[PDB]
Design a protein around this motif. Structure first.
Motif, mmCIF file in Angstrom:
data_model
loop_
_atom_site.group_PDB
_atom_site.id
_atom_site.type_symbol
_atom_site.label_atom_id
_atom_site.label_comp_id
_atom_site.label_asym_id
_atom_site.label_seq_id
_atom_site.Cartn_x
_atom_site.Cartn_y
_atom_site.Cartn_z
ATOM 1 N N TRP A 125 55.836 -22.204 40.913
ATOM 2 C CA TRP A 125 54.943 -21.202 40.210
ATOM 3 C C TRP A 125 55.140 -21.379 38.732
ATOM 4 N N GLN A 151 56.148 -21.528 47.061
ATOM 5 C CA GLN A 151 54.860 -22.063 46.596
ATOM 6 C C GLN A 151 54.556 -23.209 47.528
ATOM 7 N N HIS A 155 54.800 -26.727 46.308
ATOM 8 C CA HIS A 155 56.152 -27.176 46.008
ATOM 9 C C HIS A 155 56.892 -27.740 47.234
ATOM 10 N N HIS A 199 47.526 -28.214 42.441
ATOM 11 C CA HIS A 199 48.834 -27.649 42.229
ATOM 12 C C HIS A 199 48.818 -26.543 41.191
ATOM 13 N N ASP A 237 50.033 -22.597 41.144
ATOM 14 C CA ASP A 237 51.146 -22.189 40.316
ATOM 15 C C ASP A 237 50.739 -21.036 39.394
HETATM 16 ZN ZN LIG Z 1 54.511 -26.138 40.303
#
Ligand SMILES: [Zn+2]
Ligand SMILES: *[C@@H]1O[C@H](CO)[C@@H](O)[C@H](O)[C@H]1NC(C)=O
Ligand SMILES: *[C@@H]1O[C@H](CO)[C@@H](O)[C@H](O)[C@H]1NC(C)=O
Ligand code: NA
Ligand SMILES: [Zn+2]
Ligand SMILES: [Zn+2]
Length: 267
Positions: free
Chosen positions: A1, A122, A125, A148, A152
Protein backbone atom coordinates in the motif's frame (compact mmCIF):
# COMPACT_ATOMS: atom_id res chain seq x y z
CA UNK A 1 0.00 0.00 0.00
CA UNK A 2 0.85 3.65 -0.14
CA UNK A 3 1.09 5.80 2.97
CA UNK A 4 -2.67 6.11 3.56
CA UNK A 5 -3.12 2.31 3.49
CA UNK A 6 -0.26 1.74 5.96
CA UNK A 7 -1.36 4.45 8.35
CA UNK A 8 -4.95 3.10 8.28
CA UNK A 9 -3.76 -0.39 9.11
CA UNK A 10 -1.67 0.99 11.99
CA UNK A 11 -4.50 3.07 13.46
CA UNK A 12 -6.81 0.03 13.37
CA UNK A 13 -4.17 -2.01 15.20
CA UNK A 14 -3.90 0.68 17.90
CA UNK A 15 -7.68 0.22 18.54
CA UNK A 16 -7.33 -3.52 19.21
CA UNK A 17 -4.05 -3.97 21.12
CA UNK A 18 -4.01 -4.58 24.88
CA UNK A 19 -2.74 -1.77 27.10
CA UNK A 20 0.41 -3.68 27.94
CA UNK A 21 1.09 -4.05 24.20
CA UNK A 22 0.53 -0.32 23.66
CA UNK A 23 3.01 0.44 26.42
CA UNK A 24 5.57 -2.06 24.99
CA UNK A 25 5.35 -0.47 21.56
CA UNK A 26 5.35 3.14 22.79
CA UNK A 27 8.52 2.40 24.77
CA UNK A 28 10.34 0.90 21.80
CA UNK A 29 9.22 3.69 19.50
CA UNK A 30 9.78 6.64 21.92
CA UNK A 31 6.30 7.92 21.14
CA UNK A 32 3.35 7.80 23.53
CA UNK A 33 1.02 9.79 21.34
CA UNK A 34 -2.33 8.49 20.08
CA UNK A 35 -0.59 8.04 16.65
CA UNK A 36 2.35 5.95 17.90
CA UNK A 37 1.97 3.08 15.33
CA UNK A 38 0.59 5.24 12.52
CA UNK A 39 3.58 7.62 12.84
CA UNK A 40 6.03 4.83 11.88
CA UNK A 41 3.84 2.79 9.43
CA UNK A 42 5.42 4.38 6.27
CA UNK A 43 9.07 4.26 7.41
CA UNK A 44 9.91 1.07 5.50
CA UNK A 45 8.79 2.74 2.28
CA UNK A 46 11.23 5.62 2.75
CA UNK A 47 14.08 3.47 4.08
CA UNK A 48 14.07 1.23 0.96
CA UNK A 49 15.19 4.14 -1.26
CA UNK A 50 18.40 4.75 0.68
CA UNK A 51 21.66 2.89 0.16
CA UNK A 52 21.47 1.44 3.70
CA UNK A 53 17.87 0.25 3.17
CA UNK A 54 18.09 -1.08 -0.40
CA UNK A 55 18.44 -4.63 1.00
CA UNK A 56 14.89 -4.40 2.41
CA UNK A 57 13.07 -3.70 -0.86
CA UNK A 58 12.08 -7.38 -1.39
CA UNK A 59 10.65 -7.51 2.13
CA UNK A 60 7.44 -5.83 0.92
CA UNK A 61 6.48 -8.75 -1.33
CA UNK A 62 6.05 -12.46 -1.78
CA UNK A 63 6.10 -12.96 -5.50
CA UNK A 64 3.65 -15.82 -5.85
CA UNK A 65 4.25 -17.85 -9.02
CA UNK A 66 0.64 -18.85 -9.56
CA UNK A 67 -1.53 -18.52 -12.70
CA UNK A 68 -4.20 -15.90 -12.07
CA UNK A 69 -7.06 -15.59 -12.52
CA UNK A 70 -7.37 -19.32 -13.31
CA UNK A 71 -5.45 -20.47 -10.27
CA UNK A 72 -3.98 -18.69 -7.22
CA UNK A 73 -1.58 -19.85 -4.52
CA UNK A 74 1.51 -18.95 -2.48
CA UNK A 75 4.31 -21.32 -1.54
CA UNK A 76 7.06 -20.06 0.74
CA UNK A 77 9.97 -22.08 -0.58
CA UNK A 78 9.01 -21.55 -4.21
CA UNK A 79 8.12 -17.87 -3.92
CA UNK A 80 10.22 -16.16 -1.26
CA UNK A 81 13.53 -16.18 -3.22
CA UNK A 82 17.15 -15.79 -2.17
CA UNK A 83 16.87 -12.06 -1.37
CA UNK A 84 14.09 -12.61 1.21
CA UNK A 85 10.45 -11.61 1.20
CA UNK A 86 7.64 -10.32 3.40
CA UNK A 87 7.32 -13.71 5.08
CA UNK A 88 10.99 -14.15 5.88
CA UNK A 89 11.10 -10.53 7.15
CA UNK A 90 8.12 -11.15 9.43
CA UNK A 91 10.01 -14.14 10.88
CA UNK A 92 13.26 -12.18 11.30
CA UNK A 93 11.84 -9.03 12.84
CA UNK A 94 9.29 -10.86 15.02
CA UNK A 95 12.13 -12.98 16.45
CA UNK A 96 14.20 -9.86 17.15
CA UNK A 97 11.28 -8.46 19.11
CA UNK A 98 10.76 -11.78 21.05
CA UNK A 99 14.48 -12.21 21.82
CA UNK A 100 15.89 -8.66 22.11
CA UNK A 101 13.04 -6.14 22.66
CA UNK A 102 15.39 -3.80 24.60
CA UNK A 103 18.27 -3.92 22.08
CA UNK A 104 19.19 -1.55 19.31
CA UNK A 105 17.47 -3.62 16.55
CA UNK A 106 13.98 -3.57 18.14
CA UNK A 107 13.10 -0.11 16.80
CA UNK A 108 13.43 -0.97 13.12
CA UNK A 109 12.05 -4.50 13.77
CA UNK A 110 8.83 -3.01 15.10
CA UNK A 111 8.55 -0.49 12.25
CA UNK A 112 9.06 -3.36 9.78
CA UNK A 113 6.38 -5.55 11.41
CA UNK A 114 3.84 -2.69 11.40
CA UNK A 115 4.47 -2.03 7.69
CA UNK A 116 4.90 -5.50 6.32
CA UNK A 117 1.77 -6.97 7.94
CA UNK A 118 0.03 -4.21 5.98
CA UNK A 119 1.79 -5.18 2.69
CA UNK A 120 0.95 -8.91 3.07
CA UNK A 121 -2.69 -7.84 2.83
CA UNK A 122 -2.30 -6.00 -0.52
CA UNK A 123 -3.12 -8.80 -2.96
CA UNK A 124 -0.64 -7.52 -5.62
CA UNK A 125 2.12 -7.56 -3.02
CA UNK A 126 1.58 -11.34 -3.09
CA UNK A 127 1.76 -11.92 -6.86
CA UNK A 128 4.63 -12.37 -9.36
CA UNK A 129 2.76 -11.61 -12.61
CA UNK A 130 4.11 -8.51 -14.31
CA UNK A 131 6.05 -7.49 -11.14
CA UNK A 132 2.88 -7.59 -9.04
CA UNK A 133 0.89 -5.80 -11.74
CA UNK A 134 3.41 -2.93 -12.08
CA UNK A 135 3.78 -3.91 -15.74
CA UNK A 136 0.05 -3.75 -16.41
CA UNK A 137 -0.71 -0.23 -17.63
CA UNK A 138 -4.28 0.96 -16.98
CA UNK A 139 -6.40 4.07 -17.06
CA UNK A 140 -7.86 5.36 -13.79
CA UNK A 141 -10.13 8.39 -13.85
CA UNK A 142 -8.49 9.50 -17.11
CA UNK A 143 -4.93 9.14 -15.84
CA UNK A 144 -2.37 6.63 -17.04
CA UNK A 145 -1.10 4.44 -14.22
CA UNK A 146 -0.69 0.72 -13.54
CA UNK A 147 -2.71 -1.98 -11.82
CA UNK A 148 -0.37 -2.25 -8.82
CA UNK A 149 -0.48 1.48 -8.20
CA UNK A 150 -4.29 1.70 -8.19
CA UNK A 151 -4.47 -1.01 -5.50
CA UNK A 152 -1.71 0.65 -3.47
CA UNK A 153 -2.93 4.19 -3.81
CA UNK A 154 -5.61 5.47 -6.23
CA UNK A 155 -8.42 3.27 -5.00
CA UNK A 156 -7.85 3.40 -1.23
CA UNK A 157 -7.37 7.19 -1.40
CA UNK A 158 -10.60 7.56 -3.35
CA UNK A 159 -12.46 5.44 -0.79
CA UNK A 160 -10.94 7.25 2.22
CA UNK A 161 -11.51 10.71 0.66
CA UNK A 162 -7.85 11.73 0.80
CA UNK A 163 -4.27 10.74 1.54
CA UNK A 164 -3.16 12.34 4.82
CA UNK A 165 -2.62 11.01 8.28
CA UNK A 166 -5.83 12.59 9.56
CA UNK A 167 -7.80 11.06 6.66
CA UNK A 168 -6.18 7.70 7.58
CA UNK A 169 -7.34 8.12 11.19
CA UNK A 170 -10.91 8.76 10.10
CA UNK A 171 -10.79 5.79 7.68
CA UNK A 172 -9.40 3.54 10.42
CA UNK A 173 -12.27 4.64 12.71
CA UNK A 174 -14.70 3.56 9.99
CA UNK A 175 -13.13 0.14 9.52
CA UNK A 176 -12.69 -0.43 13.23
CA UNK A 177 -16.45 0.05 13.67
CA UNK A 178 -17.03 -2.54 10.93
CA UNK A 179 -14.90 -5.03 12.93
CA UNK A 180 -16.38 -4.33 16.34
CA UNK A 181 -20.10 -4.08 15.55
CA UNK A 182 -20.68 -3.59 11.81
CA UNK A 183 -20.06 -5.31 8.45
CA UNK A 184 -17.25 -7.61 9.70
CA UNK A 185 -18.47 -8.27 13.22
CA UNK A 186 -19.83 -11.79 12.62
CA UNK A 187 -16.73 -12.97 10.75
CA UNK A 188 -13.78 -11.25 12.48
CA UNK A 189 -13.65 -13.84 15.26
CA UNK A 190 -12.15 -16.25 12.64
CA UNK A 191 -9.57 -13.76 11.31
CA UNK A 192 -6.86 -14.93 13.67
CA UNK A 193 -7.40 -18.67 13.14
CA UNK A 194 -4.02 -20.35 12.83
CA UNK A 195 -2.05 -17.53 14.50
CA UNK A 196 1.08 -18.95 16.23
CA UNK A 197 3.84 -16.81 17.70
CA UNK A 198 6.17 -19.82 17.65
CA UNK A 199 5.74 -20.07 13.86
CA UNK A 200 5.90 -16.65 12.15
CA UNK A 201 6.32 -18.26 8.67
CA UNK A 202 3.19 -20.39 9.01
CA UNK A 203 1.19 -17.51 10.44
CA UNK A 204 2.18 -14.90 7.85
CA UNK A 205 1.72 -17.45 5.06
CA UNK A 206 -1.90 -17.96 6.13
CA UNK A 207 -2.41 -14.22 5.78
CA UNK A 208 -0.58 -14.01 2.47
CA UNK A 209 -2.53 -16.96 1.03
CA UNK A 210 -5.78 -15.29 2.14
CA UNK A 211 -4.92 -12.00 0.42
CA UNK A 212 -3.60 -13.80 -2.68
CA UNK A 213 -6.99 -15.50 -3.23
CA UNK A 214 -8.32 -12.04 -4.18
CA UNK A 215 -5.84 -11.76 -7.07
CA UNK A 216 -7.98 -14.38 -8.78
CA UNK A 217 -11.45 -13.45 -7.44
CA UNK A 218 -11.15 -9.68 -7.73
CA UNK A 219 -7.92 -8.13 -9.01
CA UNK A 220 -7.69 -10.03 -12.36
CA UNK A 221 -11.00 -11.87 -12.74
CA UNK A 222 -12.32 -9.41 -15.39
CA UNK A 223 -9.46 -10.51 -17.63
CA UNK A 224 -6.72 -8.48 -19.25
CA UNK A 225 -8.79 -7.45 -22.30
CA UNK A 226 -11.10 -5.54 -19.99
CA UNK A 227 -8.34 -4.36 -17.59
CA UNK A 228 -6.13 -3.02 -20.35
CA UNK A 229 -8.91 -1.09 -22.12
CA UNK A 230 -11.41 0.16 -19.50
CA UNK A 231 -11.22 3.07 -17.05
CA UNK A 232 -10.95 1.21 -13.76
CA UNK A 233 -12.43 4.05 -11.60
CA UNK A 234 -15.99 2.90 -12.45
CA UNK A 235 -17.29 -0.59 -12.01
CA UNK A 236 -13.77 -2.02 -11.27
CA UNK A 237 -13.40 0.32 -8.28
CA UNK A 238 -16.94 -0.54 -7.19
CA UNK A 239 -16.14 -4.22 -6.94
CA UNK A 240 -12.61 -3.69 -5.56
CA UNK A 241 -13.58 -1.37 -2.68
CA UNK A 242 -15.22 -3.98 -0.38
CA UNK A 243 -12.22 -6.25 -0.93
CA UNK A 244 -9.41 -3.76 -0.16
CA UNK A 245 -11.42 -2.39 2.76
CA UNK A 246 -11.86 -5.82 4.35
CA UNK A 247 -8.16 -6.62 3.73
CA UNK A 248 -7.04 -3.36 5.39
CA UNK A 249 -9.31 -4.21 8.29
CA UNK A 250 -7.88 -7.72 8.47
CA UNK A 251 -4.34 -6.33 8.35
CA UNK A 252 -4.97 -4.06 11.33
CA UNK A 253 -6.81 -6.71 13.33
CA UNK A 254 -4.12 -9.29 12.65
CA UNK A 255 -1.32 -6.79 13.30
CA UNK A 256 -2.84 -6.06 16.72
CA UNK A 257 -3.09 -9.82 17.54
CA UNK A 258 0.48 -10.33 16.48
CA UNK A 259 1.78 -7.39 18.54
CA UNK A 260 -0.15 -8.67 21.55
CA UNK A 261 1.65 -12.03 21.22
CA UNK A 262 5.01 -10.30 20.78
CA UNK A 263 4.50 -8.21 23.96
CA UNK A 264 2.71 -10.91 26.05
CA UNK A 265 4.03 -12.42 29.27
CA UNK A 266 2.14 -14.85 31.57
CA UNK A 267 1.42 -12.93 34.84
ZN1 LIG B 1 2.95 -1.62 -3.64
C1 LIG C 1 17.26 -9.54 10.01
O1 LIG C 1 17.24 -8.14 10.12
C2 LIG C 1 18.54 -7.55 10.13
C3 LIG C 1 18.37 -6.06 10.40
O2 LIG C 1 17.56 -5.48 9.38
C4 LIG C 1 19.23 -7.82 8.79
O3 LIG C 1 20.58 -7.33 8.90
C5 LIG C 1 19.25 -9.32 8.52
O4 LIG C 1 19.77 -9.68 7.22
C6 LIG C 1 17.86 -9.93 8.65
N1 LIG C 1 18.00 -11.36 8.44
C7 LIG C 1 17.29 -12.05 7.55
C8 LIG C 1 17.59 -13.52 7.48
O5 LIG C 1 16.45 -11.53 6.83
C1 LIG D 1 -2.77 -6.50 -21.38
O1 LIG D 1 -1.55 -5.90 -21.17
C2 LIG D 1 -0.57 -6.78 -20.63
C3 LIG D 1 0.66 -5.99 -20.23
O2 LIG D 1 1.24 -5.22 -21.29
C4 LIG D 1 -0.30 -7.89 -21.66
O3 LIG D 1 0.60 -8.84 -21.07
C5 LIG D 1 -1.59 -8.54 -22.03
O4 LIG D 1 -1.48 -9.47 -23.08
C6 LIG D 1 -2.58 -7.51 -22.51
N1 LIG D 1 -3.84 -8.10 -22.91
C7 LIG D 1 -4.61 -7.47 -23.87
C8 LIG D 1 -5.86 -8.12 -24.22
O5 LIG D 1 -4.27 -6.40 -24.40
NA1 NA E 1 10.90 -13.75 25.06
ZN1 LIG F 1 2.63 -0.80 1.08
ZN1 LIG G 1 5.78 -1.54 1.54
Amino acid sequence: WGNLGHETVAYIAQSFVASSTESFCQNILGDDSTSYLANVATWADTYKYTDAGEFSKPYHFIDAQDNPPQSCGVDYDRDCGSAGCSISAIQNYTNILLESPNGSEALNALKFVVHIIGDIHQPLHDENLEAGGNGIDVTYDGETTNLHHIWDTNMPEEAAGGYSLSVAKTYADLLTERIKTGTYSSKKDSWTDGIDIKDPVSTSMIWAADANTYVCSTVLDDGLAYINSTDLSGEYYDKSQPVFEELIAKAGYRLAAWLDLIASQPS
